[PDB]
Amino acid sequence: CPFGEVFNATRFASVYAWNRKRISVLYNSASFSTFKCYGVNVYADSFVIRGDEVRQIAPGQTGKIADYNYKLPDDFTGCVIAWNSNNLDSKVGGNYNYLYRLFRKSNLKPFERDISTEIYQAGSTPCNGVEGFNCYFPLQSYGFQPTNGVGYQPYRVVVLSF
Amino acid sequence: STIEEQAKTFLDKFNHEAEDLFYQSSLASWNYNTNITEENVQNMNNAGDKWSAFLKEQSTLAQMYPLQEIQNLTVKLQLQALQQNGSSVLSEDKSKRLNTILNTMSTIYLEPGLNEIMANSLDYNERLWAWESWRSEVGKQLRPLYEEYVVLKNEMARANHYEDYGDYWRGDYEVNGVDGYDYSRGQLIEDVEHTFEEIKPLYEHLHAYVRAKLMNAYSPIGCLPAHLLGDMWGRFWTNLYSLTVPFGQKPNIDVTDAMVDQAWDAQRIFKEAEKFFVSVGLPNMTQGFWENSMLTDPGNVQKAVCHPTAWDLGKGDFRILMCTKVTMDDFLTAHHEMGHIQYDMAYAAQPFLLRNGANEGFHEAVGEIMSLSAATPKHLKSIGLLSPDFQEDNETEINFLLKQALTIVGTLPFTYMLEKWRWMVFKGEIPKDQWMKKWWEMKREIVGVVEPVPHDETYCDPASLFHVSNDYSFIRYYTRTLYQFQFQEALCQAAKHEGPLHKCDISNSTEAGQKLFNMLRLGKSEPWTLALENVVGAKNMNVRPLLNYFEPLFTWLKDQN
Amino acid sequence: DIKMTQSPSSMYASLGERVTITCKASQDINSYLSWFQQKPGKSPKTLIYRANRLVDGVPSRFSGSGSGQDYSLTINSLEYEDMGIYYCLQYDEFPFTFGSGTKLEIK
Amino acid sequence: EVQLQQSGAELVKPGASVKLSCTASGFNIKDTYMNWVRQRPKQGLEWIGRIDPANGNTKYDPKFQGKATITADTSSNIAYLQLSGLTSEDTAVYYCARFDYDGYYVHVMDYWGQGTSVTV
Ligand SMILES: *[C@@H]1O[C@H](CO)[C@@H](O)[C@H](O)[C@H]1NC(C)=O
Ligand SMILES: *[C@@H]1O[C@H](CO)[C@@H](O)[C@H](O)[C@H]1NC(C)=O
Ligand SMILES: *[C@@H]1O[C@H](CO)[C@@H](O)[C@H](O)[C@H]1NC(C)=O
Ligand SMILES: [Zn+2]
C-alpha cells in the first residue's frame, strides 16, 4: 500500500481542508508520539494542527477542531497517529501557510468537510460580503516558530479508518 | 443574538490575534536586550508601534459592547480590561506633550559612582556633600516639570472618572460585583495605615539600636541622619550591617568559598533551583528554558543588560536573563527568578487578558518565599554547601534576623511615607508653596529621619528616585512584604513544621506545593481576596505572621534597649 | 472504459405510482455511483451519492440501493416535479462514465 | 452563496479556437477539483476532464485528448477550457461542475454552472 506518499509527503494540508486518500512496521517505527487505535477500503486523512489539539482527535470530544474542523463518530473503528514536525513546518519569522476555522453556525457531522469562505454573522445586520462589525472572516492562520513550546508546535496527524 | 455571545466571539478573535502580535513584540525585545545594536533597536521600535496600534484599534472596537448586560464574570473582566482607553482620553497635543515629557524625564535622570561612594565610604563630609549635590542639581530642574506632569496625569485621570491619579493607581486592588469579597479603593488606605500602626514598635526598637550604634560611631534623642542609611535615599539598611552587627567576632554563613572549592557554575545553581522546585510538587523547566536562555555573560565581544529578569514570551516560551557569578547572592536570585517563571507557567491556561498575578504584590511575594526557604541553614546543610559539623546557636540566629530586619523592616516606613505623600499630593491637600513643608515633616514623624540640610520649595527631592521619575507605583513593596510572610506561615503550618518560623523549609512536602498551586493556577480571573483565603484563610492583609517570624529579635532588642 | 447500461429508456407513470430505474455496470465499482436529475432547460442536479446517501434538502421519497454491478433508484409517490431525464454516473476509475438516460413522463 | 459563472455564447468557424471561463465565488478553487462536462443537442452527458488547481495535475477522457486543455489560475479564481480544431460535431453546451463526493467525503453537495452554448 502507498503508505510512503501518505506519511512522507512534502506538503501537508490544512485542517479545514484536510486531505483524504483511498487505500507492524508503522507500530514499531517508534517515530510517532501518539498512536491510539479504537475498536481494534481504508481511508487515510492527513492534516496539521497544534499539539494541544491532538487530544481533540478522538470520539466524543469538544472544542474548536472537533466541532468546526474535523469530527470523528462515536462508533469509530480506526487508528490515530500524530507526530511532531517542528523541524519542517516552522521557520524563523513565522510560517503562516496553515489555516483553521474558528466560527461556524453549527457543529460538523462526522467526516464532514467545509471549505466555504462566507463571512460569519454574529449580530443582526447582514455582512453584505465585507468584513466589519460583528462580521468575521472564518479562517485564521496558525503561527509556527522554532522557539515555541511543545503545545504550540506543529503536529502532523494521520487518521486511518477501516 | 444577545450581547454576551457577540462579546464572546469578539474576545475569541482578539485572543488569537494578540497572541501572535505579542509574541513578535516580545521576541524583538529579547533580541535587543541580549545584543545592543542599532538594528535591534529599530526592530524593537517597529514591533512596539505595531502592538500599540493593534491594541488601540481593538480597544476602540471593544468599547461598543455595554457592560450592563453581561452576567458572566470572566467575560465582564476581559471586557473591562479591554475597554480602558487610557492616554488616548486626552487630546493629541496633550498626548504628544506627555510622551515628550516622559522621554525628557528619562534622559535627564548616579550609577555606579555615587551609589558605591555612599555604599562603601565612611567619611561624613563626602556623604553629606554628595547628598546635597545630588538633591540640588537634578531636582531643581525637575520641580516645575514634576508639577506640570502631575497636572497632565491629573487631567487624564479626571478624564476617566477617577478622582485622582492616586485613585487610578489604587484601582488595581478594587474588586466589584462579587458578594462578600468586594474591596473598595479607600480600604487600601485604611488597612495600610492600620498595618503600619501595628508595624511601628519593631521599627522603633530597631531604629533605636541602629542610632545607638551610629552615636557610638559618630543627638541622644534626635532623628537619625538622612545620609547614613548607606544609599542615596535610605531604601535599604543592608549597607550598615558591618557597622551594626551585634556580635562582631562571629563569622557569617558565606558559602562562596565552598562553591569555589567544588567548582560550581550557573548550570549547577539552576539545576539545584530546579530540584528544589520539583521536590515540592511543581513541574520542572522546559527544554526551551535550557536551550534559549542566557545564564552567563556573553564575553566582552557583545554587550548586554546583566539585570536578572524572567521572560514569558508567550506560546509556551519561558526564559531567564542573568549574568551569573558563583556567589550566594546569585544562588538565591536564581531561586527568585525561577519562582517567577513557575508562577508564569502556572496560569498559562487562562485567557490572554487574565494571564497575570492577582495584584501587583503577588509575583514578588512568590519570588521571596522561595528564597526564604532556600536561605535556611538546614537547606544548605542538606545540599552539602555547609559542613555537617555546624552548630546553631542564639548569636547566629540573631545575626541572620538582624540582616533580614535591616533589609525588610527598615524599608517599610520609607515606602509607606512615599506612597502617602504621593497620594495626598495628587489629592490636592498639600498646596504647592508648602509641598516640601509636608515632605520633610513625614520624613521625621513617620520615618524618624531628619534632613541634614534645610531645603525650600525650589527642590524636587523625591524625583531623584528611579521609580518616581519613571511613573511607577510604590505600595506593591508593602503588599509584597505582608503577603510573603502570610504565605510562608500558611505553607509551614501545612507542612507540619515544629519550632520558630524563621527556620522552616517547605522542601520534600507536596501539601504546601498543592496549597500554593491551587492559588497559582487561578491567575487574575478569580478575585485576589478569595485566592488569598484559599491559601491562608483570611481575606485581607495581616501583620501577625511577620511578628511571629521576627519575635526572637524583638525579644533581644527589648532586652538590649 | 467502464461501459454503463441503463434501462428502461422511457416510461409513463401516474401520480402516486412507484418507479424503479436500473443502472448496471460492466465490472465492480465498489458502490461509487451517483444519480442525476435534469429538468427541461436546466442544469443537472445530484440526488444520491454512494448509492444510498441523500443530499441534504432532497425529499425523503427518493431512495437508492445496490451493490457490485447492479444499482437502482426508486421513487415512492411520483409527483409533477419528478418528470425529466435521469442519469447515473460512476467515479471509481478514470475516465468517469455517464449513462444513456431515462425519460419519465406523466400520463 | 456558492456560484459558478460561465462565459457567454461563442460562434466559432470550423478549425478555429475558443477559450471558455468558469469563475468561482464563495470558495477557493485550490481546495477542490473542477470538472468539465459536455451535452450535445438531444444527446446524453459526457465527461471531459478535471483539474486540481493546487498543483495543476489534470485527467482526461482519452477521446478528447489533444482537443481540450484545462487551466486554472488560483489568484483570479478562474478555470479555463481551451478548445482547438473544432468541427461541426462539437456544437454543444459546456458545463463546469464541482462535485465533492469525488474526493470521497460525506455530507456534501454538488454545484454546477449555467452552461455556455458554442456553435460551429
Ligand atoms: C519515510 O521516510 C523514512 C526515511 O526516509 C523511512 O524510514 C520511513 O519508513 C518512511 N515512511 C514510510 C511509511 O515508509
Ligand atoms: C462563562 O462562559 C464560559 C465559556 O464562555 C463558561 O465556561 C462559564 O461557565 C460561564 N460562566 C458562568 C457563570 O456561566
Ligand atoms: C529530601 O529528601 C531526600 C531523600 O530522602 C533527601 O536526600 C534530601 O536531603 C531531602 N531534602 C532536605 C532539604 O532535607
Ligand atoms: Zn521579583
DSSP B346-404: HTTTS-GGG-S-SSTTTHHHHHHHHHHHHTSHHHHHHHTSS-TT----HHHHHHHHHHH
Straight-line distance from the first to the last Cα atom of chain B, in angstroms, rounded to the nearest whole number: 73
Q: CB D28 to CB A111 under 8 A?
A: no
Which atom of ligand 1 lies nearest, measured to the CA of A6? 13
Number of the ligand 1 atom closest to the C-alpha atom of A8: 1
Q: Which among A1, A8, A156 is positioned nearest to A89, based on CA atoms?
A: A156
List beta partners, residue D21: D80
β pairing state of D45-52 and A99-101 = unpaired
DSSP-derived pairing of the beta strands C102-105 and C10-12: parallel
In this structure, the number of other CB atoms found within 10 A of the CB of residue D23 comes to 16
Binding positions of B are 135, 235, 307-308, 336, 340, 364, 439, 443, 477
Write out the residue range of the structural domain in which residue B3 sits: 1-84
Q: Per the CB < 8 Å rule, is A149 touching B12?
A: no
Asked if residue B112 has a cis previous peptide bond (ω within 30° of 0), the answer is yes
Residues from chain A contacting residue D104 (CB–CB below 8 Å): 20, 22, 43
> What SS3 state is found at B192?
helix
Instruction: Please count the residues of chain B.
Output: 561
Is residue B92 a part of any domain in this protein?
no
Q: How far apart are CA B114 and CA B119, in angstroms?
A: 8
Domain extent at residue C95: 4-105
CB B547 within 8 A of CB B199: no
- Count structural domains, chain A: 1
Ligand lying nearest the CA atom of residue B74:
2
Final residue in a domain of this structure, among B52, B84, B116: B84
- Which residues of B are documented as binding site for substrate? 235, 307-308, 477
Measured between alpha carbons, how far is B113 from B119 in angstroms, rounded to an integer?
A: 10
Half-sphere exposure of B184 (CA within 13 A, CB side): 5
Handedness of CA B141, B144, B147, B149 (dihedral sign): negative
Q: % helix / strand / coil in chain D, to the nearest 5?
A: 10, 50, 40
The number of beta carbons lying within 10 Å of the beta carbon of residue B458 is 11
Q: Which grid cell sits at A104?
A: 461556524
A86/B contact by beta carbon, under 8 A: no
Return the CATH number at A72: 3.30.70.1840
Structural domain includes residue B33: yes
Does the domain spanning D3-119 belong to CATH 2.60.40.10?
yes
> Residue B277: helix, strand or coil by DSSP?
helix
Which of D106, D109, D111, D117 to probe the C interface (max C CBs under 10 A)? D109
Residue A99 amino acid letter: L
| HSE-up (13 A, CA, CB side) for residue B404 | 24
C64–chain D Cβ distance below 8 A for any pair: no
Three-state DSSP class for residue D17: strand
Beta carbons within 10 angstroms of residue D109's beta carbon: 16
Whether B335 contacts B370, CB under 8 Å: yes
Torsion (CA) A108, A112, A115, A117 in degrees, nearest 10: -20
- How many angstroms separate the CA of residue A86 from the nearest CA in chain D? 24
How many domains does the structure of chain B reveal? 2
Measured in angstroms, the CA of D104 and the nearest CA of chain A are apart by 7
| CB-based touch B/C (3+ pairs, under 8 A) | no
A-contacting residues in B 6-35 (Cβ below 8 Å): 6, 9-10, 12-13, 16, 19-20, 23-24, 27
Please report, in range form, the residues annotated as the binding site of B for Zn(2+): 336, 340, 364
The answer to whether the CB of A36 falls within 8 A of the CB of A78 is no
B237 burial class (0-12, 13-18, 19+ CB within 10 angstroms)? buried
Q: Would the CB atoms of A117 and D27 count as touching at under 8 Å? A: yes
Q: Which of B26, B50, B84 is a domain's end point? A: B84
A103 pocket-lining for ligand 1 (C-beta < 6 Å): no
Q: Is A7 in the pocket of ligand 1 (CB under 6 A)?
A: yes
Q: Whose CA is nearest to atom 13 of ligand 1?
A: A4
Chain C touches chain D, with at least 3 Cβ pairs below 8 Å, answer yes
Query: Ligand 2 pocket check: which of B4, B74, B354 to mutate, most ligand atoms within 8 Å of Cβ?
Result: B74
Burial class of residue D70, CB neighbours in 10 A (0-12, 13-18, 19+): buried
Residue B104 lies in a domain: no
Provide residues of D within 8 Å CB-CB of chain A: 1-2, 26-28, 31-32, 100, 103-108
Closest residue on chain C to D112 (Cα): C43
Please tell me which of the candidates D26, D104, D108 has its beta carbon nearest to residue A43.
Answer: D104
Among chain A residues, CA nearest to B316: A149
Closest C-alpha to B13, from A104, C14, D49, A136: A136
Q: Which residues of B are identified as catalytic?
A: 337, 467
Q: What is the CATH number of the domain that holds B499?
A: 1.10.1370.30
CA distance B369 to B484: 6
